[PDB]
Amino acid sequence: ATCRDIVTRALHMAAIVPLGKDPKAAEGQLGLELLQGLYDGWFAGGMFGRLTDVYTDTAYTAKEGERVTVDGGTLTIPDTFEDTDTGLTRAPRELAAIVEINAGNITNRVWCGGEWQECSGLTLNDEAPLSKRDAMGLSCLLALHMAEAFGTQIGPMTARRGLQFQGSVSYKLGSTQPDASGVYY
Amino acid sequence: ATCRDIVTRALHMAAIVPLGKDPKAAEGQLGLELLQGLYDGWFAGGMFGRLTDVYTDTAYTAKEGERVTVDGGTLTIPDTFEDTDTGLTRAPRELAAIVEINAGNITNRVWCGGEWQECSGLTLNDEAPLSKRDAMGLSCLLALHMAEAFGTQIGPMTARRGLQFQGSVSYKLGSTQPDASGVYY
Amino acid sequence: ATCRDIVTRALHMAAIVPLGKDPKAAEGQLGLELLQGLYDGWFAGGMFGRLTDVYTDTAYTAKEGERVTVDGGTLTIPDTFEDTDTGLTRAPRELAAIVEINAGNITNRVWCGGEWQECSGLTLNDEAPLSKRDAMGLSCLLALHMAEAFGTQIGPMTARRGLQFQGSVSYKLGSTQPDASGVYY
Amino acid sequence: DLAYGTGAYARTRGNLPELPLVNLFVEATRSDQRGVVLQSRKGLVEDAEVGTGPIRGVFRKDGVLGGAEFVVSDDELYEDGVSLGTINGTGPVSFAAIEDELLVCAGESIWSYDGTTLDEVTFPDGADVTKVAYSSGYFIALRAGTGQWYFSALYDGTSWDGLDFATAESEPDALLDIVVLDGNPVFFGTQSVEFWSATGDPDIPFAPIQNRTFEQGIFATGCAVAIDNSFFWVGADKIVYRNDAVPVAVADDGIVERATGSTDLRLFLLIDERHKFVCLRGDTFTMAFDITTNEWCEFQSYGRTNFRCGPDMGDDETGIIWRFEGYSDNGGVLERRFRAGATLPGPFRVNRLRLICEVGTTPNLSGEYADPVIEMRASDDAGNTWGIWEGETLGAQGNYRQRVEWRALGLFDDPGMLFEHRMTAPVSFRVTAVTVNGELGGRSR
Amino acid sequence: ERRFRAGATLPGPFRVNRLRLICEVGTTPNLSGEYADPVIEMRASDDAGNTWGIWEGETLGAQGNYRQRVEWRALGLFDDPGMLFEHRMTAPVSFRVTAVTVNGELGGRSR
Amino acid sequence: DLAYGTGAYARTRGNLPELPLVNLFVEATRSDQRGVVLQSRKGLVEDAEVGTGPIRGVFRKDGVLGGAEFVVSDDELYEDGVSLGTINGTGPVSFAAIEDELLVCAGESIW
Amino acid sequence: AAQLFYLPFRPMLDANALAVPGAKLYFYATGTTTKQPVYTSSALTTQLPNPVVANAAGKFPAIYLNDALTYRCYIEDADGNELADSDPYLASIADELTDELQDVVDAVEADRVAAANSATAAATSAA
Amino acid sequence: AAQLFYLPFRPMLDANALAVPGAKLYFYATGTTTKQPVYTSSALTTQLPNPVVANAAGKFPAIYLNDALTYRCYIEDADGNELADSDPYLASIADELTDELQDVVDAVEADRVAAANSATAAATSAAQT
Amino acid sequence: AAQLFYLPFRPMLDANALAVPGAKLYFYATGTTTKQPVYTSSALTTQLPNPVVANAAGKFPAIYLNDALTYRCYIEDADGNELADSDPYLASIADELTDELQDVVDAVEADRVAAANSATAAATSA
User: CA dist D154 to B79, D143, D148, D178, Å?
Assistant: First the structure.
């Protein structure tokens, strides 16, 4: 689902915009900025785990879960990985995040739907990242924050759906995930 | 039941659309989107269990509870399985989920009513993948989220029926299920 | 009592339709669908116990409490069983369920009133599969869910009677039932 | 408790919601706490078949010529169903009678009947007469196209003198109508209304009342009636006016809208047991203003573009005289339609719509109308677009506890909700109230 | 051109979330052209009309859209002197104003 | 609910808030609980072209001179579009008619 | 060539595009609920039962209406559900012999006579 | 005046819309009960069982008719009842034919039959022999 | 006289015989894209939107046209893709009958050609 569709459905669930009517340009821009802020807070806030900080200057191929500071170099995102447990080629784990800090600008990529989707520089036409997991849940999550700007409060069920989407994103229970480690000394 | 019937009865139980009357195009589209989002959220949030990740490039045969990523091969969905405990041919376990990831296309299949029904890319003319379990329960569950977009709320009994349907789906008590196993190291 | 009688008395007990007047076709259809959904949820939800899953392709004779997937054979429903404990012929235990899945068609049979009565494909002129146990209780249970669609709430006593019927069905205390078994290792 | 329209309000300007009242009128009551109810008009039943064309005028005075029936079927005069002669055409028919003389005018000439023969009356200068009336022993005739009116001799309608005329000075155009109010003539012209009184002087019998005129004229001939010690007229601006020290406009904006869309207007009077309806008839409508309740209703006949009963209770295209009885309109179907509803500031759930109406009063036990059907049809966009008619039963004969209630109407929004109820059975009908989301009770009804 | 004003004097701060114009909608005689979807503009003033904001335009709805809602959402806070909203429509179509509402209910059904 | 300006009120003395009502007038209604609505005046369409200068006066009576219409142009009289003559005067035009005679005044002479 | 087989009639379809079995069509006077007669054939002699009932396949019989009267059609599901209604029923479907059909049938007849006479001529000239 | 809008597109309704799982779709010759072949796809290669019935799941298969011959459609109920009979199966018409169109159409069909009989008589009996 | 009843309740279906929800039906002018009004009732006072949107079941409301004009039907799905188009809006079953009978008249023409060829072959041989 595109960002425009997600913003429209978010405004529909909050009943701010009547069903079947498209929103204005101002509310669409506000929804787009709210979605961008949500994605940026998810990436910087550690929703996808504590990203390992690495620094490179030559060509470097990143693996799952890092932020790479590129200083005059090239970063190559791979579509497959060598699983250490069994040695067979595998797709990147679901909701695997790679952050690139190049020349002062930041690019966030997440692996979902079998592809790397960028959550930076989003406009109303690009496909919304993580929309395939639950487009309506993401719309409810966006409405949770958008409803206050219009002087209204969403119902309990819409908020419940939004928090359910957020908790499902944070849990990563739907697919195989790396095992948890610890320190024993 | 088709998705159109599910949406219509969801709106009727919510007492939003007059009883016995079909809803407008906007209501049907919103209900279809909400149902699709609910199905994708169930498949991604682990409602059908933690799906083991499998990566393939040649021809592969699917198993129960697998997330198969294919980039050139063909995945075959079998209608029968060889039981490990007993040895005889058996039908797939109730609410067995298989996810196909093909070049960004996500296809969720669930086993119910003796058939694999796809929960991805549903239209109003497609059969509801879980209607045979409880059509009224699914309608109530959909209404739980539909009623908020219309500025109203539904009664406690409709909500109780919806969460009863959801809990029955999550429990899977009605049929034989694989035994739970743990680790002991 | 037929399904039409059950729906009529359910609407009467909720005071929605005055006594002595039959409901319209729309409410009759809604009540029939609610009853069908209730029966389907009872069968799939494990109300009649966890059903053993079997798969057959030749002619097979089923026992109590199984779900049978037919893949080209015939399923025979016996009206008598050989009691393992005592050895003499007996009738099937009260509320014994048999589910049959044939080419995607689901048929649910329950033993009540000394006969196998089907809970699938019910119309308004068919006998209610559990009216013999308590017709008024079944009507109250149906009204408990039906009253919400009409913007009304039933009295506490009607709800108590409906849940009493449901608990009587779940308990199965009236007649002898198979003894509980456990695992001791 | 929904509020139904107490009067016909169909204003098409600005696309305002319309609240038609078809064959129903507001009547005050004492049994109900609300005070007013909607009562159905009685059906038309033939009383006498006279002539072979439309009825133009009916005269029946017991003290005149033995109380015979004088009917103008097309261009013929009939006495108790017996033809008397041929009368002139186009203009509307006016009567003026005394104990032994009857003058009939049809806009062209005057015809006199004294019980023996029908004779044309010679008028001064051979001019055409538009209206003929009787007042204080004199016969008054309006010359067509002039502002002067002639008066005859004492109790003689066949003796008109060319010098026996009076002119309305304040109205320079031609006069159009006469109304005999309080025993004195009132003259309606195209520009003013003149009040004249009989002074009793043989040479000049009538004198105008100075400093008492209305600047509003009359639209055409036949648009003035007299009732309840007052008179109603149609002004030159197609607005219905009542007589008063300052005339008031008893016609609202919608009534004027309907009147303006038609080219021909006729004002007459209809009588029900206690109800005096001032009926304004156009080309495609026939509205009635109730004297007792000051409300406008609409009368229609099924299958026809306009109400069957014309002036003086006569048919508009057949030689049938009507009378009110049994709500069986000419043995056919009597349609009763009305609208209730309300405006809403936001969402509103309608689960029950009850109608406190007549139940179990049908006189039919072996016919399709043993149980009449009343259809309700709902709308949310202020009545612009409507749903499918849903029918309920008023109950068989004797079923006096029948409930006329719809169920689960649904969510309605900001424009409001509007429900239209229509019944088309030849049975008595009355609406007391419309209730929304009523209490759920009852006892074996 | 048809222009009017609706306003109120306030004792203190007031937040306007919605401005609804209950009026005549969906009655345009033109199906194609410039006036297929007529535009009505609204502008707001907080200093009792002395200084106004930019015109914001809504559509009265195409022919047949009798359920169209004339809503304005991007309205801010209004202080002591009061609020004054000016509405102006300049299309050769029928126009009737029934009411002006502020901060109404959010319910509806596919309008 | 906001109360709109029912009547055109525009006071410049004291800088009072103005509520102009352009091409709209209040009419009482029965279909709404508020009772009154704002209705727009109908547009102007040409009925007849008579002269070149401003139309100082129009007279038309059904019973006067056979129902013919009389229109005063800048300094000219017209009957049914046909000029009758030149009328002297620079003031408002007044008509006085009887069955057979019409008098026109413009400030100096009677015609 | 090959042609996909389609249903030989037009039943009323439900929300899921399935034929409604036993649907009841009521023909009333316009704006009223008064029963109006319907006829089996164009002779307008045999009267169909006005609540016309379709068979189990949703097929309706040939219904003929008196053109001198205007009709209202009210369709219902077999159990009484109100499906659709049209108060002024204007039979705006033309079913007369337009000259295209007339010339087509005339050409078919003429070619049939041509083929017949050619066959007879061949039989005489050969045997 | 006013014109009631009728949808001018023939619906693409196959046997699945019948909602009768026990129905039989017989395809005879036009006028007689001789049984005509029915094919699976547009290639007209594989023959369906002419007493067409639904499968074990209650789903009717796609039915393809060749336009070379004229078929007669017959619908049989599971209990032995007649439901839908079409003497000449016309493809893209779904409404009932009026009596005038009816006798026009079977007169055309009879003319075709007579022309075919004359043509085959001339070809076989006269020319070849 | 006698008039045959034609069912006016016609929902529109795609090539797969399924209900099309939210189908937009446009009533254009003959051969152009100019829009013409459509009315809810036979009185031709209230006007439906020219793009008529079907409900969730794919059923259109009662549409009344002005016979004084000539219409064109243009169906699009909810996404805007083409479904069906009829430039001359014909409401006569006679044209459908002619379209069906085109095949039979061509077949009969070929039959006549074959019969004439056979007759000339018989004449030449004998």
Answer: 114, 20, 19, 19
